[PDB]
Write an enzyme that holds these catalytic residues in place. Structure first.
Site, PDB file in Angstrom:
ATOM      1  N   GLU A 119       3.266   1.660  14.312  1.00  0.00           N
ATOM      2  CA  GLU A 119       3.332   3.154  14.764  1.00  0.00           C
ATOM      3  C   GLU A 119       1.797   3.737  14.568  1.00  0.00           C
ATOM      4  O   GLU A 119       1.181   3.565  13.310  1.00  0.00           O
ATOM      5  CB  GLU A 119       4.483   3.810  14.177  1.00  0.00           C
ATOM      6  N   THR A 162     -58.624 -16.715  11.837  1.00  0.00           N
ATOM      7  CA  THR A 162     -57.748 -17.394  10.922  1.00  0.00           C
ATOM      8  C   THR A 162     -58.258 -18.218   9.997  1.00  0.00           C
ATOM      9  O   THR A 162     -57.792 -18.343   8.925  1.00  0.00           O
ATOM     10  CB  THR A 162     -56.334 -17.923  11.568  1.00  0.00           C
ATOM     11  N   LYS A 169     -58.547 -16.543   2.328  1.00  0.00           N
ATOM     12  CA  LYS A 169     -57.363 -17.080   3.144  1.00  0.00           C
ATOM     13  C   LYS A 169     -57.879 -17.738   4.483  1.00  0.00           C
ATOM     14  O   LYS A 169     -57.166 -18.531   4.975  1.00  0.00           O
ATOM     15  CB  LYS A 169     -56.315 -16.012   3.639  1.00  0.00           C
ATOM     16  N   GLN A 195      -5.549 -14.761  10.633  1.00  0.00           N
ATOM     17  CA  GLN A 195      -5.106 -13.742  11.315  1.00  0.00           C
ATOM     18  C   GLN A 195      -5.887 -13.680  12.737  1.00  0.00           C
ATOM     19  O   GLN A 195      -7.483 -14.004  12.761  1.00  0.00           O
ATOM     20  CB  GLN A 195      -5.496 -12.619  10.651  1.00  0.00           C
ATOM     21  N   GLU A 245     -11.177 -10.738   3.823  1.00  0.00           N
ATOM     22  CA  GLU A 245     -11.705 -10.290   5.347  1.00  0.00           C
ATOM     23  C   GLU A 245     -12.939  -9.819   5.269  1.00  0.00           C
ATOM     24  O   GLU A 245     -13.755  -9.840   4.340  1.00  0.00           O
ATOM     25  CB  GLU A 245     -10.583  -8.941   5.694  1.00  0.00           C
ATOM     26  N   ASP A 286       0.758  -1.266   0.242  1.00  0.00           N
ATOM     27  CA  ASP A 286       0.090   0.012   0.047  1.00  0.00           C
ATOM     28  C   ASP A 286       0.918   1.138   0.002  1.00  0.00           C
ATOM     29  O   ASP A 286       1.950   1.170   0.243  1.00  0.00           O
ATOM     30  CB  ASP A 286      -0.971  -0.017   1.129  1.00  0.00           C
ATOM     31  N   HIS A 287       0.397   2.436  -0.637  1.00  0.00           N
ATOM     32  CA  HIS A 287       0.919   3.797  -0.341  1.00  0.00           C
ATOM     33  C   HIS A 287       2.210   4.047  -1.306  1.00  0.00           C
ATOM     34  O   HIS A 287       2.569   4.853  -1.779  1.00  0.00           O
ATOM     35  CB  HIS A 287       1.127   3.942   1.035  1.00  0.00           C
ATOM     36  N   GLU A 334     -54.412 -23.150   6.419  1.00  0.00           N
ATOM     37  CA  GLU A 334     -53.141 -22.799   7.321  1.00  0.00           C
ATOM     38  C   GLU A 334     -53.794 -21.556   8.570  1.00  0.00           C
ATOM     39  O   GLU A 334     -55.197 -21.476   8.454  1.00  0.00           O
ATOM     40  CB  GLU A 334     -52.079 -21.753   6.548  1.00  0.00           C
TER      41      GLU A 334
END
Ligand SMILES: CC(=O)N[C@@H]1[C@@H](O)[C@H](O[C@@H]2O[C@H](CO[C@H]3O[C@H](CO)[C@@H](O)[C@H](O)[C@@H]3O[C@@H]3O[C@H](CO)[C@@H](O[C@@H]4O[C@H](CO)[C@H](O)[C@H](O)[C@H]4O)[C@H](O)[C@H]3NC(C)=O)[C@@H](O)[C@H](O[C@H]3O[C@H](CO)[C@@H](O)[C@H](O)[C@@H]3O[C@@H]3O[C@H](CO)[C@@H](O[C@@H]4O[C@H](CO)[C@H](O)[C@H](O)[C@H]4O)[C@H](O)[C@H]3NC(C)=O)[C@@H]2O)[C@@H](CO)O[C@H]1O
Ligand SMILES: [Ca+2]
EC number: 3.2.1.96
Length: 787
Positions: free
Chosen positions: A244, A779, A654, A205, A141, A63-64, A659
C-alpha cells in the site's frame, strides 16, 4: 516440547523432505498485536497466526514495531506454537548493518576476533533465542546512498562465520536455520562468496522485470555464477506483493493489476510474474528450492494500475487498492500447489533408471527429482559390482565427468547409454572394467582414449571407436591404447573390421606449444622473407603430432593400422590446420628500434630479436641473424644521472627510466637536460621518444619536440663537481661549452639517428622549438652503444 517440534521441522526442511518450498516475508507492523513507539495499535486486520500450512517458512520482517510491543511476547508464546503445529518454521530477518558496526549490538563490540565472536553470540541470543524463532536470515542489499567500506564487509563476513559456528548446518545448534537474502550478484557479493558453504538457503530477491523477452535474463545469468557456490536445491527466488502507498521505485507489478469489473483479479495467478517464478527452473545444477514472496500480508490485493506508476511521496496519487484489508492467503496457496504438482519434482523411479544400484548412486549424487537429471552438470562416480546395467545414464545429458570405477558386472557401453555431452568432450574415466564385453564409443568426437583402462578390459569381444577425433598415428599414445583393445578382442575371436572398428578419425588441429628455431639465419640476398612462414608455422594433434604443411598432412591422411586407413577420406587440410589469424611479430633490431611486421628484407648484416604473439600472449621468442648479424646495442643512457636542467630536477630524471609514462617540459619553447652516463663508452645512435609516445596521457602530436640538439661536453679536462651549484648551472647552460653530435629537424613520434662514434661522459639535450605554440614535451631519451 516446543523446541523439539521446531528442531525436527528444521531437520525435515534441511534434508529436503518438503518438495518445492514456499516462503513469505510477513511485515511485523501488519500483525494486529503490533504497537508503535506511542503504544498504539498499527493495523488490526491481519495476523501471522493465520498463515496457512502451504507456507513452509515464515520470515519475521521487522520494522516500525516498537521494542516494548505486545507483538514480541505474542510471537514467542503463541505464534511459534500455532505455526509449528501445521509444520511452518519461523525465521528472524536482520539487516547486514547489525553485523558491520553501523547499527544495533554491532556498535557495542570491537572489530577484533574475540570482539566479533562475542557479537555473534549476542546476535543469536537477541534475535533467535530470545524471540523464540527457528533461525536467522541476514539481509544484504545494495546500499545506494553510502556504500559499505571494504572493512565493513570484511567485519560482517567474520561475524557471519562466527554465527554459522553457533547455529545452522555447521553450528553447535543444528536445530536452527541460517539463511541469506540478497539483491547482489556474485561479482558484487563478497559476503556471499565467503559464507555460502554455511548457508541453508540463499533467497534472491527479483522483484519486477529482470530483462529480456521472458523477463528472466538476470536470473539466468546470475544463476550461472551462484551455481559455483551453492546447489540449485538451496536457491530461492522472490517476487513482491503490492505494498500500500508504494511509490515509484517500489512498484514491481508482480501480481495482476486492479480490475474495476472484477474485484477478485488480485487473486488470479494467470499471467503474473509470480506464476512465472513458480515455474522457472535453472538450466544447470538442479531444480530450484522454491519461491518466496515479500509482503505476504498483502496476498491477494490487486496491484495499483499502470497509470499510477509515477506517484511519489510528494506527488501522492491514491487508489482503492491502497486500503488495508484482511487476506486469506489464496495466492500463496495457489503458488505452492502449482509447484508441488509440477511433475519435475516427482522422484527418480525405476522407470527412469531400472538398475537399483545405479539408481541409488545417481540419486545420492545428482539429487532426487526427475528434473534434476537433465540439469546436473558436474561429476558422477559409479562404483561396485552391484551395477549390472547402465540404462538411464543417458538422461544425465549435461554431465561433465563420468567415472566408472570397478564396475565388474557391466557388459555393454554404447553411445545410446551415454550422456549427449560425451559428444562435446565430457571427461570419461573407466577403471577395472573386468566384465565389459561391448565397448562402443563411435560417433562421440572423442579426442583421446585417456582414462580408459584398457589393460583391465580382459573380456572384451568387440569395440567401435570409429567416427571420433583420434590421432592414431605411429607415435600417438592412442595407437598404443588401440593395440591393447585389439589384443583383447583377438583372445576371444578372429579380428574383423566390424568388431575392432576404428576408421574415420578426424583429429582436431591445435597450435604447437613451442617452436624449434631458437636462432634463425638469412643470407643478404636482397629479398623479402616471412618469419611466420619460415619459423612459426604448423599444427599439432591433441597428442602433439606435428603437421608442418599440406604435404605433411597428406602423408598423415594415409596412416594405417594393419593396412586399414584410420583417417576419414574427405578430411581436408583446411579443416585441420590452424590459420594463425591475428598473429603478430615484434622485432627489435641491434638498434634497439622496434617494429611490428612478419616481413624482413635482407639487405644488410643485421640482428633482430623476435617476439611472436597470438594477440594475447608471447608464443615464441628467437634471435634472427641476417648475414653475419650485428652486436646488440645497449641503452647506455639508462638511469643516467641528471646534473643540470632548465626545468624541474625530478621531472628530468624520468627521461632516463625505462618508460614513456611521463613527460618533460618547461614553461616555454626551449629547455635543456644535462646528464652523466657515469662510465665512458662508445655511442653510435640516439633515440628520442616524442610527446605523443606518452603512455599515461593521450598526447597529441602538436605537443611534440620539433627542433633539438644533442651535445657533448666539449672540454673533457674539467671537474664538474668542483664548481659550486650556481656556477655549475651556468656552465651547463652556456652553449659554447657543448659540441653538437646530432641535430633533429622533424617532429617524428620517435626520432633516431647515428653518432660519429662519440665517446663522452657528459651530455646535454636541448629542445630548441616545438611543433606548435604549445610547450613541447618528450618522454624518454636513449644513447645507444657498446660496453
Ligand atoms: C528482504 C527485503 O524485502 N528487503 C527490502 C525491503 O526492506 C523493502 O521493503 C520496505 O522495507 C522498509 C523497512 O526496511 C527495513 O529493512 C531494510 C532491509 O534490511 C533496511 O534497509 C531498512 O533501513 C529497514 O531496516 C529496519 O531499520 C530499523 C531502524 O534501524 C530497525 O529497527 C531497529 O531495530 C533494532 C533491533 O530490533 C532496535 O530495536 C532499534 O531501536 C530499532 O530502531 C529494523 O530492525 C530494521 N529492519 C530490518 C528487517 O532490518 C519498510 O519501511 C517499507 O514499508 C513502508 O513503505 C511501504 C510502501 O512503500 C508501506 O506499505 C509500509 O506499510 C511501510 O510504510 C511505513 O509504515 C509506518 C507505519 O505506519 C509509517 O510510520 C508512521 O508513518 C506516519 C506517516 O504520517 C508518521 O511518520 C508516524 O510517525 C510513523 O510512525 C511509515 O511512515 C511508513 N513509511 C512509508 C515510506 O510509507 C518496505 O516494506 C523492499 C521495498 O519493496 O525492498 C527489499 O529489498
Ligand atoms: Ca621516461
Amino acid at each position: 516440547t516446543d523446541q523439539q517440534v521446531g528442531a525436527k521441522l528444521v531437520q525435515e526442511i534441511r534434508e529436503g523432505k518438503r518438495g518445492p518450498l514456499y516462503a513469505g516475508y510477513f511485515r511485523t507492523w501488519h500483525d494486529r498485536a503490533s504497537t508503535g513507539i506511542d503504544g498504539k495499535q498499527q493495523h488490526p486486520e491481519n495476523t501471522m497466526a493465520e498463515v496457512p500450512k502451504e507456507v513452509d517458512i515464515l520470515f519475521v520482517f521487522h520494522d516500525h514495531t516498537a521494542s516494548d510491543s505486545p507483538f514480541w511476547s505474542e510471537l514467542k508464546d503463541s505464534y511459534v506454537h500455532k505455526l509449528h503445529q501445521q509444520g511452518t518454521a519461523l525465521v528472524q530477518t536482520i539487516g547486514v548493518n547489525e553485523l558491520n558496526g553501523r547499527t544495533g549490538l554491532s556498535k557495542d563490540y570491537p572489530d577484533t576476533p574475540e570482539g566479533n565472536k562475542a557479537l555473534a553470540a549476542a546476535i543469536v541470543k537477541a534475535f533467535v533465542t530470545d524471540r523464540g524463532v527457528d533461525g536467522l536470515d541476514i539481509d544484504i542489499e545494495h546500499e545506494f546512498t553510502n556504500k559499505r567500506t571494504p572493512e565493513e564487509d570484511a567485519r560482517a563476513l567474520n561475524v557471519f562465520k562466527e554465527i554459522a559456528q553457533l547455529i545452522g548446518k555447521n553450528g553447535s545448534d543444528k536445530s536452527k536455520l541460517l539463511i541469506m537474502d540478497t539483491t547482489l550478484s556474485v561479482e558484487n557479493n563478497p559476503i556471499f562468496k565467503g559464507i555460502a558453504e554455511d548457508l541453508d538457503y540463499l533467497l534472491r530477491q527479483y522483484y519486477g522485470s529482470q530483462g529480456g523477452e521472458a523477463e528472466v535474463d538476470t536470473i539466468n545469468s546470475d544463476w550461472n555464477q551462484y551455481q559455483n557456490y551453492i546447489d540449485a536445491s538451496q536457491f530461492m527466488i522472490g517476487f513482491s506483493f503490492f505494498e500500500e502507498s508504494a511509490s515509484k521505485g517500489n512498484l514491481w507489478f508482480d501480481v495482476n493489476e486492479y480490475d474495476p469489473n472484477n474485484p477478485e483479479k488480485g487473486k488470479d495467478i494467470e499471467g503474473t510474474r509470480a506464476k512465472k517464478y513458480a515455474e522457472w527452473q535453472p538450466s544447470t545444477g538442479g531444480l530450484k528450492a522454491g519461491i518466496f514472496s515479500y509482503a505476504i500480508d498483502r496476498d491477494g490485493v490487486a496491484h495499483v494500475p499502470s497509470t499510477y506508476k509515477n506517484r511519489t511521496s510528494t506527488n501522492l496519487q491514491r487508489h482503492e487498492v491502497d486500503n488495508i484489508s484482511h487476506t486469506d492467503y489464496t495466492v500463496s496457496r495457489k503458488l505452492k500447489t502449482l509447484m508441488t504438482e509440477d511433475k519435475r519434482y516427482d522422484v527418480i523411479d525405476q522407470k527412469d533408471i531400472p538398475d537399483p544400484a545405479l539408481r541409488e548412486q545417481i540419486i545420492q549424487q545428482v539429487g532426487q527429482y526427475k528434473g534434476d537429471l537433465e540439469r546436473y552438470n558436474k561429476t558422477l562416480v559409479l562404483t561396485g559390482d552391484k551395477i549390472q546395467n547402465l540404462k538411464g545414464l543417458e538422461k544425465l545429458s549435461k554431465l561433465q565427468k563420468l567415472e566408472l570405477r570397478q564396475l565388474s558386472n557391466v557388459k555393454e557401453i554404447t553411445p545410446e547409454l551415454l550422456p549427449e555431452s560425451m559428444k562435446k568432450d565430457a571427461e570419461l574415466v573407466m577403471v577395472g572394467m573386468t566384465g565389459l564385453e561391448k565397448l562402443n564409443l563411435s560417433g562421440l568426437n572423442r579426442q583421446t582414449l585417456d582414462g580408459i583402462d584398457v589393460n583391465s578390459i580382459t573380456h572384451l569381444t568387440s569395440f567401435d571407436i570409429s567416427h571420433n577425433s583420434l590421432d592414431l598415428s605411429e607415435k600417438s599414445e592412442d595407437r598404443k591404447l588401440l593395440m591393447t583393445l585389439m589384443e583383447q578382442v583377438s583372445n576371444h575371436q578372429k579380428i574383423t573390421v566390424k568388431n575392432t572398428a576404428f576408421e574415420n578419425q578426424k583429429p582436431k588441429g591445435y597450435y604447437p606449444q613451442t617452436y624449434d628455431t631458437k636462432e634463425g639465419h638469412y643470407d643478404v640476398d636482397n629479398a623479402e622473407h616471412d618469419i611466420l612462414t619460415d619459423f612459426v608455422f604448423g599444427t599439432v594433434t591433441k597428442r602433439n603430432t606435428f603437421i608442418g604443411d599440406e604435404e605433411a598432412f597428406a602423408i598423415y591422411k594415409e596412416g594405417a593400422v594393419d593396412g586399414r586407413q584410420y583417417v576419414s577420406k574427405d578430411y581436408t587440410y583446411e579443416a585441420f590446420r590452424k590459420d594463425y589469424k591475428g598473429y603478430k611479430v615484434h622485432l627489435t633490431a641491434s638498434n634497439l628500434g622496434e617494429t611490428v611486421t612478419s616481413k624482413v628484407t635482407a639487405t644488410t648484416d643485421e640482428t633482430y630479436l623476435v617476439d611472436v604473439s597470438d594477440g594475447e600472449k608471447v608464443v615464441h621468442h628467437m634471435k634472427l641473424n641476417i648475414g653475419s648479424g650485428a652486436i646488440m646495442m645497449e641503452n647506455l643512457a639508462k638511469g643516467a644521472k641528471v646534473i643540470g636542467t632548465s626545468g624541474d630536477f625530478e621531472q628530468a630524471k624520468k627521461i632516463f627510466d625505462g618508460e614513456k609514462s611521463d613527460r618533460f617540459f618547461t614553461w616555454g619553447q626551449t629547455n635543456w637536460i644535462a646528464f652523466d652516463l657515469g662510465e665512458i663508452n662508445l655511442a653510435k645512435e640516439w633515440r628520442l621518444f616524442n610527446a605523443e609516445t606518452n603512455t599515461e596521457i593521450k598526447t597529441d602530436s602538436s605537443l611534440n619536440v620539433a627542433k633539438g640538439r644533442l651535445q657533448i661536453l666539449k672540454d673533457t679536462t674539467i671537474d664538474l663537481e668542483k664548481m659550486d651549484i650556481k656556477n655549475r648551472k651556468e656552465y651547463l647552460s652556456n652553449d659554447e661549452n657543448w659540441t653538437d653530435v646530432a641535430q633533429m629537424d622533424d617532429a617524428k613520434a620517435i626520432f633516431n639517428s647515428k653518432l660519429s662514434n662519440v665517446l663522452s661522459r657528459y651530455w646535454r639535450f636541448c629542445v630548441d622549438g616545438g611543433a606548435s605554440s604549445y610547450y613541447p614535451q618528450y618522454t624518454e631519451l636513449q644513447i645507444l652503444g657498446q660496453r
